[PDB]
Amino acid sequence: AELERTFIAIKPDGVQRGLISEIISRFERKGFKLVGIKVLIPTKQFAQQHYHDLKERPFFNGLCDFLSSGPVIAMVWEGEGVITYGRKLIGATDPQKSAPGTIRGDLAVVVGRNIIHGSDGPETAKDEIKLWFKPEELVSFTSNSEKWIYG
Amino acid sequence: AELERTFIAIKPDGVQRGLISEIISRFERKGFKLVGIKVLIPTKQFAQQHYHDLKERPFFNGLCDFLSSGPVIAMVWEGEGVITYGRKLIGATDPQKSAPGTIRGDLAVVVGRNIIHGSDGPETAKDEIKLWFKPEELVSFTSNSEKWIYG
Amino acid sequence: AELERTFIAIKPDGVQRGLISEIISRFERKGFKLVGIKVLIPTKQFAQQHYHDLKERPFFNGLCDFLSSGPVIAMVWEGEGVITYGRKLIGATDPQKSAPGTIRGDLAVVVGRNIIHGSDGPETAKDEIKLWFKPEELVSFTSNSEKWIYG
Amino acid sequence: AELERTFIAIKPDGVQRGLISEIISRFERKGFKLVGIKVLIPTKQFAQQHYHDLKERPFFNGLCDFLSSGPVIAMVWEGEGVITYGRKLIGATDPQKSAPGTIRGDLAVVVGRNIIHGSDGPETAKDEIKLWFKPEELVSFTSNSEKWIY
Amino acid sequence: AELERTFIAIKPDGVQRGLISEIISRFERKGFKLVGIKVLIPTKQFAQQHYHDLKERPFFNGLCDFLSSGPVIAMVWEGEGVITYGRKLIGATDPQKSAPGTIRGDLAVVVGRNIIHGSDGPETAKDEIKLWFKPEELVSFTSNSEKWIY
Amino acid sequence: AELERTFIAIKPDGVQRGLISEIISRFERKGFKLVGIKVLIPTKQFAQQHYHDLKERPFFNGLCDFLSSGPVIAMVWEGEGVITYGRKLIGATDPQKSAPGTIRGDLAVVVGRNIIHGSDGPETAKDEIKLWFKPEELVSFTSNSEKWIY
Structure with a gap:
């Protein structure tokens, strides 16, 4: 349970706006761990693979061109219920409908530039991790804070 | 749409409590721009003009005496849906009913000292701006971050 | 009304995770005052006294062993509606169900390690204060900021 | 003594990089007051009567174009020794040579884009304030925290 | 060596200006532990046996009245070299002369209201701690982060 | 000139103490870019070819065991004078001797656990970067804020 993992990615707008440290802190200070x-810089190809689910939607091409229009910070966070909470943390899809306190709510204005992405389910989480990371890049260790985060 | 503008004012209590940088950061880090x-220090006269809508209410005089009991930081923020979000950011009228994460929720205790004011609609926004600023004081420029905030 | 007081305690996990300054700031910056x-380090005995209400529940013993497994920061905050807001600030009992922006929501992962405790009512507040503090340890003064927090 | 005022301006690069809140906080939290x-958006000309003591240098023109290439947050801060501490807060002219903890040392990289400006003396202060603000634009009030700051 | 303790107190002006969280964070985040x-609210008298080494000076009385004009956050921090670094954290006695990054350099303006106090040596520390805390009030535990700090 | 790169690594004690966001911010907010x-988790061996210039010292072995006792955040930052300022940001080797405002002065206590590492020169940088990153792992893009930083 405390081994659940989700995929979080700071899209180009987020990176180009210098939100790395800020976004990372919301997950780090929560108690989740960076594994x-x-x-x-995703290739338009790779982007389409990540968005394979939306291949036949109007915006598909835009998403792919955008996700590959600049650098991206790909991450995998471990923790109990981290997938679900990663979303609670991220906020609504459209920034204008996210509550202050959530990443999108605090740091973004409109849907087209909603700075971050988080897995929306246990399965997509696994697929997304498998797609952005070679197992060698992932780590396994016990945080010192674990005794007090889960006990 | 991305040209919408709202009026935000840090009332005397907010200023006397040193919340300027803090309040400003909530709008700046969101992506909105200070135009x-x-x-x-509003004159009781001016105050009554701003609150002209409440001229025949019990608290009217209190509001006017208070809004002129000290310095005030008047601002105009530009951005898509900034008027509505400026409110979401500000929180409920009564601090005790605002959620943590909102300005009033985090930084104020009771209704009578709710530190800030934001336009509540597209029309009042225009009037309020027209009333607190001479067009010469307003600016027009394109933020460097615009390409990534709206695209 | 502005004299209400509540009991807030940073449990061992909170202290062992270095959340003192952070937790304290949420109450301090709100306008409440540290009295x-x-x-x-609670003795298992004392712990049982604090949790006397749950003496015949499965988890009772765990709670007592835990509340005495390390240092604790006991506090008493004064302010209007501070008891109720202290809870709004703390968030849901289970971190996974607290909204970003609340202490538990931002800084904790699971129910068993929900880092903090706040009185849940005007009566328990009084009892809890009476139990953790000798009247000599409590203070009474008027904050300079009072004129602007309540007026 | 505690009525000393200095002129602080966030240059276009500062504003463009969204450092308004950050900079203002360094001053607000210290105890100085925003008056x-x-x-x-400074006119190319206006820029020149600000950097006038440098009209002799080979970068005066470069400076003036830049100080008008975008919006600027002009400010006047009051407090004892504010002019001098204002500079300590800002740090060395060259970010590369500023100490971590100073505005330029933390938020800027090179001299050409040192994001902020602060009066360097009692005189330049007096002038600078008069050059950027009409006396009505300035305010006079005693902050609630004055009794505990001084 | 890592059991060294120092006495840190947030003066009335500090508390009154809501710097409790801010100050404590400078210490907590460093690695030292709040023990x-x-x-x-110090009694006029109590204030005098704290500033006793200064009962000779012409401000001893002024000091004592102030250290009792309001609430005070008294603290004891433990960690290696804490007494010395505690002072570096606090900065010069005179805020005007403290470096940005230090508690006084960032949050205070003048000497008369330098918001905080920290033991200046191993001895004054020992005494100061005994003068403000009963041995029960102090705690002894090994922080979870000790293995990674030392 | 503005393509200078340095190697920055958050040591196990740093990661274990959850200073990832904090450290990265000191660099990000300055204007440097994460490339x-x-x-x-460095292998005991890998640790040795990093601290190789110290294989002569009586702590080389101790160092190598530690740099592999847990996870490590390895990084490459680009920007003008980044190598040098990167060090100013980090502060003295010994936390006790670092100034408040520096990463070690704020977040660490002793030399043995100085939470971070930064290339000390143009050469060691070049090597260090090549030792920890495959050229594909690095990225090349011009940040939106480049026009205002330089």
């Missing part, structure tokens, strides 16, 4: 991270 | 700002 | 504080 | 503030 | 804390 | 980052 994988990397910077990279 | 007008000034410090000043 | 009593101390550090100490 | 004058406005946002404006 | 003793209380809030109290 | 390479990964998390990994």
Whole structure:
């Protein structure tokens, strides 16, 4: 249960707006642990693979062109219910409908530039991790704070 | 749409409690842009003009005496849906009923000292701006971050 | 009304995770005032006295063993509606169900390690204060900011 | 003594990089009080009568174009020794040589884009304040925290 | 070595200006541990046996009245070299002369209201701690983060 | 000139003490750009070819065991004078001797656990970067804020 993992990615707008430290702190200070991270520029190809679910939607091409229009911070966070909470933390899809206190609510204005992405379910989480990370890049260790975060 | 503007004012209590930087950061870090700002001490007269809508209410006189009991930070923020979000950011009228994460919720205790004011609609927004700022004091420029905030 | 007081305690997990300054700031920056504080390690005995209400529940013993498994920051905050708001600030009992922006929501993961405790009612508040503090340790003064927090 | 005022301006690069809240906080939290503030886009000319003591240098022109390439947050801060501490807060002219903890040392990288400006003396202060603010724009009030700051 | 303790107190002006969280954070985040804390309003007399080494000076009386003009957050911090670093954290006696990054350099303006106090040596520490805390008020535990701090 | 890169790594004690966000912010907010980052648990051996210039010292072994006792956040930052300022940001090798405002002065206590590492020169940088990152792992893009930083 405390081994659940989710995929979080700071999209290009987030990175180009210098929200890395800020976004990372919301997950770090919560008690979740960073078991994988990397910077990279998705190829339009790769982008389409990540969005394979939306391949036949109007905005599909835009999403792919955008997700590959700049650097991206890919991450994998471990923790109990981290997938669900990662979303609670991220906020509504549209910033204008997210409550202050959530990442999108505090740091973004409109849907098209909603700075971050988080897995929306246990399965997509696994797929998304499998797609952005080679198992060698992932880590396994016990945080010192674990005794007090879960006990 | 991305040109909408709202009026935000840090009332005397807010200023006397040193919440300027803090309040400003909630709007700045969101992605909205400061197109007008000034410090000043409203005259009871001016105050009544701003609250003209409440001229025949019990508390009217209190509001006017208070809004002129010290310095005030008047501002105009530009951004898509900034008027509505400016309110979401500000929180409920009564601090005790605002959720943590909102300005009033985090930084104020009771209704009578709810530290800030934001326009509550597209029309009052225009009137309020027209009343606190001479067009010369307002600015127009494109933020560097615009490409990534709206795209 | 502005004299209401509540009991807030940073449990061992909170202290062992270095959340003192952070937790304290949420109450301080709100406008409430610290009228009593101390550090100490509850004895399993004392713990049972504090949890006397849950003496015949499965988890009772766990709670007592835990509340005495390390240092604790006991506090008493004064302010209008501070009891109720202290809870709003703390968030749901289970971190996973607390909204970002609340202490538990931002800084904790699961129910068993929900880092803090706040009185849940005007009566328990009085009892809890009476139990953790000798009247000599409590203070009475008027904050300079009072004129602007309540007026 | 505690009525000393200095002029602080956030340069276009500062504003453009959204450092308004951050900068203002360094001053507000110290105890100084904001007695004058406005946002404006300096005219190429205006820029020149600000950097006038440098009209002799080979960068005066470069400076003037930049100080008008975008919005500027002009400010007036009051407090004892504010002019001098204002500079300590800002740090060395060259970010590379500023100490971590100072505005430029933390938020800027090179001299050409040192995001902020602060009067360097009692005189330049007096002038600078008069050059950027009409006396009405400034306010006079005693902060609630004055009794505990001084 | 890592059991060294120092006495830190937030003066009335500090408390009155709501700097409790801010100050405590500078210490907590460094790695030192809070082993003793209380809030109290020093009696005019109590103030005098604290500033006793200064009963000779012409401000001893002024000091004593002030240290009792309001609430005070008294604290005891433990950690290696805490006494010395505690002072570095606090900064110069005179805020005007403290470096940005230090508690006084960031949150205070003048000497008369330098918001905080920290033991200046191993001895004054020992005494100061005994003068403000009963041995029960202090705690002894090994922080979870000890293994990674030392 | 503005393509200078340095290697920054958050040591196990740093990661274990949840200072990832804090450290990264000191760099991000300055204007430097994250062009390479990964998390990994160095092998006892790997640790040795990093601290190789110290294989002569009586702590080389101690160092190597530690740099592999837990996860590590390895990073590559780009910006003008980044190598040098990166060090100013980090502060003295010994936390006790670092100034408040620096990463070690604020978040660490002793030399043995100084939570972070930063290349000390242009050469060691070049090597260190090549030792920890495959050229694919690094990225090349011009940040939106480049026009206002330089």
